[PDB]
Protein backbone atom coordinates (compact mmCIF):
# COMPACT_ATOMS: atom_id res chain seq x y z
CA UNK A 1 0.00 0.00 0.00
CA UNK A 2 2.91 2.24 0.86
CA UNK A 3 3.09 4.52 -2.26
CA UNK A 4 3.59 8.40 -2.61
CA UNK A 5 1.07 10.87 -3.47
CA UNK A 6 -0.21 11.94 -7.24
CA UNK A 7 1.09 8.54 -8.37
CA UNK A 8 -1.35 5.15 -9.30
CA UNK A 9 -1.00 1.36 -10.11
CA UNK A 10 -2.72 0.06 -12.44
CA UNK A 11 -3.08 -2.99 -15.28
CA UNK A 12 -2.54 -3.07 -19.11
CA UNK A 13 -5.62 -3.55 -21.29
CA UNK A 14 -4.92 -7.44 -22.41
CA UNK A 15 -1.48 -7.41 -20.20
CA UNK A 16 -0.88 -6.93 -16.41
CA UNK A 17 2.13 -4.73 -16.29
CA UNK A 18 2.04 -2.68 -13.28
CA UNK A 19 3.40 0.81 -13.35
CA UNK A 20 3.46 4.46 -11.87
CA UNK A 21 1.57 7.01 -13.53
CA UNK A 22 0.99 10.35 -12.12
CA UNK A 23 -2.15 12.29 -12.91
CA UNK A 24 0.03 15.51 -11.66
CA UNK A 25 3.05 15.16 -13.45
CA UNK A 26 1.34 12.51 -15.92
CA UNK A 27 4.44 10.92 -16.28
CA UNK A 28 4.57 7.52 -16.23
CA UNK A 29 7.03 4.75 -15.05
CA UNK A 30 7.23 1.07 -13.83
CA UNK A 31 10.40 1.19 -11.45
CA UNK A 32 9.58 1.95 -7.62
CA UNK A 33 9.94 5.64 -7.57
CA UNK A 34 11.56 5.68 -4.27
CA UNK A 35 13.60 9.01 -4.81
Not at 3 to 22: C, D, I, T
Request: net charge positive; aromatic share 14%; charged share 25%.
Amino acid sequence: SKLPPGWEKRMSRNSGRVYYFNHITNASQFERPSG
